[PDB]
Amino acid sequence: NPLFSPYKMGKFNLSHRVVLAPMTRCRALNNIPQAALGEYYEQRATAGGFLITEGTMISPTSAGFPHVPGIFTKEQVREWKKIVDVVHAKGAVIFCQLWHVGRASHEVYQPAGAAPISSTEKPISNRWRILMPDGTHGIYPKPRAIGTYEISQVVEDYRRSALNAIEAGFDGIEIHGAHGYLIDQFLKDGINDRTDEYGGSLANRCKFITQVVQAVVSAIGADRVGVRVSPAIDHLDAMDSNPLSLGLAVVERLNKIQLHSGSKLAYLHVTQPGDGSEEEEARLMRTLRNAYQGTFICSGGYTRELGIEAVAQGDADLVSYGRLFISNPDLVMRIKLNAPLNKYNRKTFYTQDPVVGYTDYPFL
Ligand SMILES: Cc1cc2nc3c(=O)[nH]c(=O)nc-3n(C[C@H](O)[C@H](O)[C@H](O)COP(=O)(O)O)c2cc1C
Numbered sequence: 001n002p003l004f005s006p007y008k009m010g011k012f013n014l015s016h017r018v019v020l021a022p023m024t025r026c027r028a029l030n031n032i033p034q035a036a037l038g039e040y041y042e043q044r045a046t047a048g049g050f051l052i053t054e055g056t057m058i059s060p061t062s063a064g065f066p067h068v069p070g071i072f073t074k075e076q077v078r079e080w081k082k083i084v085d086v087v088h089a090k091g092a093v094i095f096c097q098l099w100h101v102g103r104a105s106h107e108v109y110q111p112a113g114a115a116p117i118s119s120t121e122k123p124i125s126n127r128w129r130i131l132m133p134d135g136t137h138g139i140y141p142k143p144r145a146i147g148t149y150e151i152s153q154v155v156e157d158y159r160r161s162a163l164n165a166i167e168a169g170f171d172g173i174e175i176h177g178a179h180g181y182l183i184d185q186f187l188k189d190g191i192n193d194r195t196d197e198y199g200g201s202l203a204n205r206c207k208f209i210t211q212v213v214q215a216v217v218s219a220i221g222a223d224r225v226g227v228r229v230s231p232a233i234d235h236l237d238a239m240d241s242n243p244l245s246l247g248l249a250v251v252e253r254l255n256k257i258q259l260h261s262g263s264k265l266a267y268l269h270v271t272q273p274g275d276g277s278e279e280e281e282a283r284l285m286r287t288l289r290n291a292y293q294g295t296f297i298c299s300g301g302y303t304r305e306l307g308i309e310a311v312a313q314g315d316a317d318l319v320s321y322g323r324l325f326i327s328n329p330d331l332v333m334r335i336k337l338n339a340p341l342n343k344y345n346r347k348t349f350y351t352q353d354p355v356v357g358y359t360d361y362p363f364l
Contacts, residue, residue, distance in 0.1 A: 002311040003304075004336060006048075007318060009295055010223035010266055012093045012171060015048025017311055018332045019320035021271075021299055022052040022097040022174065022228070026350040027358060028069035031057055033079040036354030037069070038086045043329035043359060047091030050318065052226070052269075055099030055176050058161040059154070061117065062182075063109050064101035066133040067352055071096060071164045072157070080168035088169065095226055095266070096165040097174040098158055098216075102182025103143035104236050106130050117150070118143035119185045119192045119199065119208075124236050131350060140236075148196065151208065154182070155215045162216040162225075172224030172266050175212055177250075179230055179271075180238025183209050187229070187246060190239035202249040210253045213265075222261045226297075227254060228269040232284055233300075244284055251291040258293060268292045269320065272300035286315055304335050327361045339364050 007014045020041075027036050041051060057063050057070030070076045080096070087094045103124060105116035121142060129137035146154070162173045177183035185191045186208035192199045198207050209227070216225050231240060231247035240246045251268065258264055270288050272281050289296040298316035307319035325331045327344035334341055348357020 001308060001336065003308055003319070005311075007295075009050065009093070009318070010264060012050070012266075013048070014050055014093065014318070016046070016332060016336075017318045018049065018307070018335055019297055019318050020044050020049075020051040020325050021320035021322035022054055022176070023322050023326065024054045024065055024068055024350065025358060026065055026067045026352060027354055028054075029067045029352065031063070031068060031070040032076060033069045033083055034354065035082075036358060038083040039359045041083055041094070042086045042090060044325060044331070045087045045090035045092035045094075046332045049092050049332055051087060051092050051094045052174055052320065053094065053096045055097050056161070056165075058098050058100055058157040060111050061114070062100040062157070064105035064116070064130065065350065066109070066131070068099075071098070071161050071168065077164050077168045080165075080170070084169040093171045095172040095174050095224075096168075096170045097176050097228070098161050098165070099176040100154065100157070100182040102185045104130070104140065104181055106132065106138050106141060108133060108138070115141060115144045117146045117154075118182065119145060119194055121145045122191065122193065124180075128236050145194070148198065151198065151211075155211050158212050159215040159219045162220050166220050166224070172226060173216060173220070174226040174228055174269065175209070175216065177209050177212075177227060177229045179233060180236030183212065184230070184238045187250070188238045188240045189246075190234075190237065190241070202246065205246075206249050206253050209250060210257065213254065214257055217257060217261055217263075217265070222258060222263040222265050224266060226266040226269055228271065230271045231288075232281070233271065233273055244287060247284065247288045248291055251288055255291075255293050264294045267295035267297050267318065269297040269299060271320075272298075274301040274323075276301055282315075289315060304338065307335070329359075329361055330363045334364055337364075
């Protein structure tokens with residue numbers, strides 16, 4: 001089973017290639033990491049296994065879900081440190097995913113009910129509704145298009161959160177640049193209608209993600225930085241006219257950051273629509289992997305067998321699993337044994353209970 005061959009993710013010597021994908025679960029009440037998170041990550045941790053946390057706030061304005069954790073306050077750092085210690089006691093490696101939702105927010109989630117920020121003033125279309133704190137669904141509002149000074153300020157929010165993650169004991173951070181959130185709102189030409197140096201050309205649209213990645217690499221080292229993108233997921237109105245070329249332009253900028261840094265990133269993490277135009281989705285995935293000088297994590301609808309095939313054929317170095325990890329805390333061992341997997345319950349993906357639908361999925 002090639003899923004269980006060791007892999008050197010830079011300084012981190014992984015014992016197997018099954019990765020916990022980042023997933024928002026909304027148990028970090030008042031944006032403070034809770035003991036329930038520590039139990040949840042500890043359940044999933046394995047010796048030498050790699051975990052990526054749920055998206056984590058970089059600023060008071062960066063949220064668009066209820067009760068998601070932040071890492072911009074010292075109080076949050078203190079509570080994260082307790083979770084990281086528990087996970088490190090099982091021998092796992094853990095990165096914190098830094099997340100800004102951009103225009104995918106709502107007054108209820110913003111300080112003083114202020115407008116969310118974006119590359120653009122265009123709201124997400126009415127085809128999408130935002131989950132509200134009371135469980136109803138609301139309308140995505142018109143965002144405020146930020147200028148270049150405020151862009152540099154958001155970059156600094158990423159830099160400070162990366163340092164905070166290191167202070168909490170995280171092994172590294174992942175830049176959330178996927179799923180139509182703030183970074184994807186600069187990347188995709190279906191969203192980014194700017195006429196300054198952050199819009200128009202491929203190069204201009206890749207400026208934001210490049211500046212974020214360079215900032216965090218300069219703060220904590222490239223080998224502690226992973227980057228997640230989703231060129232071909234159109235979630236929250238996030239489409240590009242040429243996904244493969246956008247993906248290849250991002251990869252070129254990561255390759256250059258590595259050459260100029262003298263060092264490799266932890267990984268590039270590409271995620272695709274779950275229900276898959278199969279062989280063509282595979283085209284995109286292999287083309288980005290082949291373009292990128294470094295470790296590649298594939299994600300989106302992978303099964304035990306497709307994960308094995310992915311590593312065996314050289315298509316990916318690591319495979320991340322999301323939904324199956326929700327309901328199988330011991331997914332790694334289940335994959336090793338080819339043991340049958342537990343169903344998950346969508347109804348408790350984003351509820352607040354510290355146990356139900358969170359830590360009470362049974363082991364094998
Ligand atoms: C409930 C839920 C929450 C998620 N939260 C995040 C997130 O915070 N950041 C992120 O990059 N992806 C997030 N995702 C997407 C997953 O990381 C993963 O890419 C997706 O579920 C597809 O992989 P899978 O088919 O193995 O589930 C989430 C997905 C689900 C279902």
